[PDB]
Design a protein around this ligand. Structure first.
Ligand SMILES: Nc1ncnc2c1ncn2[C@@H]1O[C@H](COP(=O)(O)OP(=O)(O)O)[C@@H](O)[C@H]1O
Lengths: 51, 160, 116, 67, 838
């Protein structure tokens, strides 16, 4: 009477095989980030100590 | 946002992909089942249209990408891609080995309108441009050379 | 390798302008306003109006080929408010979101040295 | 949490199947009168009503032999 | 109304007069006019594959003017290469009418417009008949070379008998609202009584006719020895033929695409052309090589691997040991003008060719060059080569072979029958007095070549009835086959498909059932390889199914088991407890880990592991041969790119699973063999079990599902096999075990083929898809309550019952542990969607 616990749920190539009617068919493609931007904003030196 | 509509009675959106750059040139093959699309950075994805997803990436290039063309005869083993450019160049890819065949830097504006055929692998190609030069090449499979230039006075778009 | 346009975002009163130019200043690309998107004549200085205006400029400039934008905010200048309104930040937020690399935010609003 | 020895079925439906195979329902009705009304509703709301209708025509014939 | 005028060309006209199929055309067309189901018992080399549909177009089939037969004409070649070749053939034959000929080889191809006498493929018109159960369109249906007894031909005529029965029934009262249906069957042998005179297939007796031809003398030559490498034997023989023998073309009956392309490039190397045109033609023939057409087409016998066979030289000679310089066929003189190094117009012909190589057989060679075909069974009855004189036969054709309850299941190249072998040999004396060279001895040809079998006998009935369900026919228990199989066995097949999830309780196939039916393999293994694309367990599962399909690798008790025997058994048990054993003690992880150990070894270190850890060489090599091919098959069918997948090396090789992946593969093999489960008898009969630790481990009784429990004691009480990790350690066996099959020992103890152990919950999760388990009512006596969301939803808490103990007619079954379900109330009953994790 010991019950287990299991879910049990739910690179590339260099060749071709075409078809019986012409129509070539290639293998899968490899997998495919935003930016590197920056913004500088000056601080007037009367709101310095609050910062 | 790339989409494809099967033109038959099932007019539903069959496949829908998220491509990288907003693209402005597409070409399908002379046969079916090959769709090439290149963005406005250097990336020319090609897609088998039946079970629609990416079959080649082709980072490869530079600048925004002008017109391009397939080389398709049914039941072949060649399957090249043409790949024009804005800064004037033509960088031919195949599709059976994912390699840059020949790098060609010779033009001066956007390489619109290029075409590939064979005459007895000979495979002569021809690449126009916004400059007035149509500039056909011999384009062997291993190592290529040049022939005549023959200079039309236009601004050639899709020199078929 | 990126290439650069220049925004020249005009945060006027009762209107907003966005038109990217190549960084000389001559060859302007896609002049839009705040008026030619909304249809009310009351909020042609709307932040939303400037937002979709900057979206359309971003689409047209990515179509031409420029990828980064040196951005320059100009208020109406003169003996007037001398300082950007809300439409300037609205267009700035819009074309900073819309896939376009941003460079060198400035302020090119004219200063009078006590004119009339 | 789990609880062992809850083997297949409760005594109402067990006695109903046994009474239907035994052609009388007297012990079933003697249980059904006896046990509590909250439990009576809790079993009679789930009488397995689907396409052969075994359990529900057994219940109707049980009330026939009852009254 | 009567006929439309036809026309043909002069040379094909006189060729039709010269071939003897023109003699019986009027008697055949009158038998067609007087009866629908007409049998023709012709042969290859006659002409009946080609000119009889032209006779039907002459008779008025396809003529719109006739109100009796205004419909289509369908010619059903079972091979798509035969379909396109006879399509272009009759397009040449009808000539000015020749645009009325069409082909349809796959399902995605629809009807072309310009034809009314159209060729097609067997599976193509079965899917056509499936979505058109009435078959309004086709006025006639031609089943040629039906003598092969394919599964497609069997299902084909089994549907077509009831089809022509109902169509004639609806027609004979009213020709306007219902047209005729003329069924025309052909064959190569004359044993067509299983098609015509079977009362289950036909209560109404249909008329039988013949129209055979003539043949020149075939000189058959059997060799004094029989060579191992039949490719090198046939190649050496055919170079001696093209060197020395008088002119006449060659047909080489060999096996597969790989061997045939190797022989074609070797023949072009031996007899080359200087001319660029013929050299580039041979280059195109060698370049255009393969095609598969996996799902969206019909299938044939070129799956190219599902075969666990193995071989050697002593094995071959011990198979043919009854067989206990100047060679036959080396008699005639080389003719003048025929050099020994003449150019050879070499042509491959396998079923996986493109059309632009399938048309190149019928072109005349360059002058001074002799024609040559290297092929397989397409040119046996369907196709014939106009010009051959020498045929040379290896005597081995790839078909289905499967023997039961022992884990032998191979799509291997066996040994061809005597009748089909003589039908292959009869293509020698066909253009003149010819020469057949059978690449063996006549003692071999006597012994191991049987005389006259169907694919429906060679293939499992579960895959057969799954094929029928994917073709969507439901009255299968009384369906008219020529060989109707065991009704007990096919009812067990329907029960098995309901257990696996292919068939619902109203007997319509599911999507998982169709994805099982796509496979050229067993339904259990197809279920395994469909389900195990989850959480990176596919190399492990393909290793397990490859091991079970290849057989036992362990050299365990075919040998010892006084001064060296003790040490050798001790080191054998040490090799068991070594890297064969590291993970658990269930059973089958050793069978995984010995094949995972084939990655931890360089190629020049090959023999030491088998010769140390007691493994068989050819079986251990053919499992690592089969693993790549089986992973290719299932990746090709289930991955999003059908044909273009390739198999790299390390992903077929290995990795190492820790805990989640071993329990996940445990529920995968449970999904494989969900009806071969077993229980320790304490949980059904604790008095009869006598559960003690000193009972031997091959004596603690196990009980299977669905088996009768009579008051005799050892009815269900089947025991563990000695060749597991229990009977070797045996501390306490877990309660629910699995087995592959059962083998009765000499002490009347049915020993097992035990696999693994599940506690309760993955067994329940696997069974949920199947129709094994019947649920209880929601049980909330002392536990926590059922929560509803709606009158059709439920979050209740139920115990499941596995072996259907409701109305227990001795089919033994056991309860499980309570589990929380999520129901949906379909049509009065509460089906289950999922479970709820803790
Ligand atoms: N596609 C084709 N092109 C030219 N000739 C063919 C073709 N197919 C078959 N033949 C020839 O037609 C003749 C008649 O054979 P066929 O009608 O095909 O088979 P069967 O003899 O079984 O009726 C054969 O000698 C064969 O060589």
């Amino acid at each position: 009477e010991d019950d287990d616990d299991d879910v049990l749920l739910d690179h590339e190539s260099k060749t071709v095989v075409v078809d019986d009617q012409g129509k070539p068919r290639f293998t899968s493609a490899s997998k495919t980030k935003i930016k590197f931007e920056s913004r500088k904003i000056m601080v007037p030196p009367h709101r310095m100590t609050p910062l | 946002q790339l989409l494809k509509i099967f033109h038959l009675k099932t007019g539903k959106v069959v496949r829908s992909m998220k491509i990288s750059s907003p693209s402005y040139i597409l070409d399908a093959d002379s046969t079916s089942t090959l769709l090439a699309v290149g963005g406005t950075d250097g990336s020319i994805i090609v897609v088998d249209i039946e079970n629609g997803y990416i079959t080649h990436s082709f980072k490869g290039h530079g600048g925004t990408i002008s017109s391009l063309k397939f080389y398709g005869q049914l039941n072949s083993k060649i399957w090249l891609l043409a790949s024009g450019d804005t800064n004037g160049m033509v960088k031919v890819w195949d599709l059976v080995k994912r390699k840059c065949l020949h790098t060609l830097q010779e033009h001066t504006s956007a390489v619109r309108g290029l075409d590939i055929i064979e005459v007895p692998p000979s495979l002569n190609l021809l690449s126009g441009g916004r400059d007035d030069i149509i500039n056909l090449w011999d384009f062997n499979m291993k190592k290529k050379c040049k022939l005549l230039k023959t200079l039309p006075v236009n601004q050639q778009v899709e020199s078929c | 390798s990126q290439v650069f346009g220049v925004a020249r975002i005009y945060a006027s009163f009762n209107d907003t302008f966005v038109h990217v130019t190549d960084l000389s200043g001559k060859e302007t690309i896609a002049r839009v306003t705040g008026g030619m998107k909304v249809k009310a004549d009351r909020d042609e200085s709307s932040p939303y109006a400037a937002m979709l205006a900057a979206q359309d400029v971003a689409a047209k400039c990515k179509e031409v080929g420029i990828t980064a934008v040196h951005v320059k905010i100009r208020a109406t200048g003169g003996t007037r408010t001398k300082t950007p309104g809300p439409g300037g930040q609205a267009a700035l937020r819009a074309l900073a979101r819309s896939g376009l690399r941003i460079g060198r935010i400035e302020d090119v609003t004219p200063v009078p040295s006590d004119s009339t | 949490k789990v609880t062992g020895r809850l083997g297949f079925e409760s005594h109402f439906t067990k006695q109903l199947r046994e009474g239907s195979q035994s052609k009388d329902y007297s012990s079933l009705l003697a249980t059904l009168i006896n046990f509590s009304p909250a439990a009576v509703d809790l079993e009679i709301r789930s009488l397995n009503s689907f396409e052969p209708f075994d359990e529900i025509v057994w219940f109707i014939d049980a009330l026939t032999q009852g009254l | 109304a009567f006929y439309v005028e036809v026309s043909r060309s002069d040379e094909i006209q006189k060729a039709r007069i010269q071939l003897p199929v023109f003699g019986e055309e009027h008697k055949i067309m009158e038998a067609i006019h007087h009866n629908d189901v007409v049998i023709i018992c012709g042969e290859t080399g006659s002409g009946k594959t080609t000119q009889v549909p032209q006779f039907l177009y002459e008779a008025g089939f396809g003529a719109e003017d006739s109100p009796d037969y205004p419909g289509m004409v369908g010619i059903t070649q079972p091979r798509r290469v035969a379909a396109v070749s006879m399509a272009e053939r009759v397009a040449n034959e009808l000539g000015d009418h020749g645009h009325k000929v069409g082909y349809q080889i796959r399902f995605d191809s629809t009807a072309k417009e310009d034809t009314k006498v159209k060729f097609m493929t067997d599976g193509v018109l079965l899917r056509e008949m499936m979505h058109d159960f009435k078959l309004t369109k086709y006025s006639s249906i031609i089943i040629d070379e039906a003598h092969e007894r394919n599964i497609n031909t069997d299902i084909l005529i089994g549907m077509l008998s009831r089809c022509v029965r109902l169509r004639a029934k609806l027609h004979k009262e009213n020709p306007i609202e219902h047209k005729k249906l003329k069924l025309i069957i052909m064959s190569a042998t004359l044993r067509v009584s299983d098609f015509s005179e079977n009362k289950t297939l036909f209560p109404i007796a249909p008329p039988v006719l013949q129209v055979d031809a003539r043949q020149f003398p075939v000189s058959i030559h059997f060799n004094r020895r029989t060579a191992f490498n039949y490719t090198d034997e046939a190649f050496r023989k055919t170079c001696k033929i093209h060197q020395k023998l008088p002119p006449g073309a060659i047909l080489v009956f060999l096996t597969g695409q790989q061997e045939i392309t190797h022989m074609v490039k070797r023949l072009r190397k031996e007899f080359p052309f200087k001319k660029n045109s013929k050299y580039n033609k041979d280059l195109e023939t060698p370049v255009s090589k393969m095609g598969i057409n996996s799902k969206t087409t019909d299938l044939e016998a070129e799956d190219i691997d599902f075969s666990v066979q193995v071989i050697d030289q002593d094995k071959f000679k011990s198979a043919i040991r009854y067989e206990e310089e100047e060679e036959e066929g080396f008699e005639e003189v080389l003719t003048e003008g025929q050099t020994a190094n003449d150019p050879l117009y070499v042509l491959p012909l396998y079923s996986l060719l493109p059309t632009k190589e399938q048309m190149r057989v019928f072109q005349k060679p360059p002058q001074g060059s002799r024609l040559c075909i290297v092929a397989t069974n397409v040119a046996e009855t369907s196709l014939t080569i106009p010009g051959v004189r020498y045929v040379v036969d290896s005597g081995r054709s790839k078909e289905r072979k499967y023997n039961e309850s022992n884990g032998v299941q191979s799509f291997e190249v066996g040994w061809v029958s005597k009748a089909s072998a003589n039908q292959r040999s009869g293509r020698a004396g066909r253009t003149g007095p010819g020469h057949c060279y059978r690449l063996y001895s006549s003692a071999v040809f006597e012994h191991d070549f049987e005389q006259f079998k169907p694919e429906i006998l060679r293939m499992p009935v579960e895959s057969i009835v799954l094929q029928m369900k994917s073709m969507a026919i439901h009255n299968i228990i009384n369906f008219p086959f020529p060989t109707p199989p065991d009704r007990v066995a096919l009812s067990k097949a329907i029960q098995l498909l309901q257990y696996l999830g292919a068939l619902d309780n109203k007997e319509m196939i599911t999507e998982d059932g169709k994805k099982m039916s796509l496979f050229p393999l067993s339904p259990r293994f197809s279920k395994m390889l469909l389900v195990s694309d989850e959480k990176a367990c596919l190399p492990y599962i393909v290793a397990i199914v490859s091991a079970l399909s290849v057989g036992d690798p362990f050299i365990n008790e075919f040998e010892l088991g006084p001064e060296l025997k003790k040490e050798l058994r001790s080191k054998f048990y040490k090799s068991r407890s070594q890297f064969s054993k590291l993970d658990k003690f269930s059973d089958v992880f050793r069978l995984l880990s010995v094949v995972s150990a084939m990655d931890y070894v360089p190629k020049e270190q090959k023999e030491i592991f088998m010769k140390k850890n007691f493994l068989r060489g050819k079986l251990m090599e053919e499992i690592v041969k089969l693993r790549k091919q089986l992973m290719y098959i299932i990746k090709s069918n289930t991955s999003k790119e059908n044909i273009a997948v390739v198999i790299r090396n390390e992903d077929l090789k290995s990795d190492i699973p820790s805990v989640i992946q071993i329990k996940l593969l445990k529920q995968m093999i449970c999904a494989g063999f969900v009806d071969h489960v077993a229980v320790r008898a304490d949980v059904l009969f604790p008095d009869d079990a006598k559960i003690t630790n000193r009972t031997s481990i091959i004596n603690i009784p196990y009980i299977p599902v669905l088996a009768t429990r009579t008051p005799n004691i050892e009815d269900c009480f089947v025991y563990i096999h000695p060749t597991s990790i229990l009977n070797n350690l045996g501390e306490m066996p877990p309660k629910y075990m699995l087995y592959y099959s059962l083998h009765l020992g000499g002490n009347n103890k049915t020993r097992m083929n035990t696999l693994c152990d599940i506690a309760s919950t993955p067994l329940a999760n696997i069974a949920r898809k199947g129709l094994l388990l019947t649920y209880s009512k929601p049980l909330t006596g002392q536990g926590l309550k059922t929560v509803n969301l709606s009158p059709t939803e439920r979050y209740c808490y139920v115990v499941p019952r596995f072996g259907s103990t409701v109305d227990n007619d001795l089919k033994i079954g056991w309860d499980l542990n309570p589990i929380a379900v999520h129901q949906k109330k379909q049509k009065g009953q509460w089906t289950v969607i999922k479970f709820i994790t803790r």
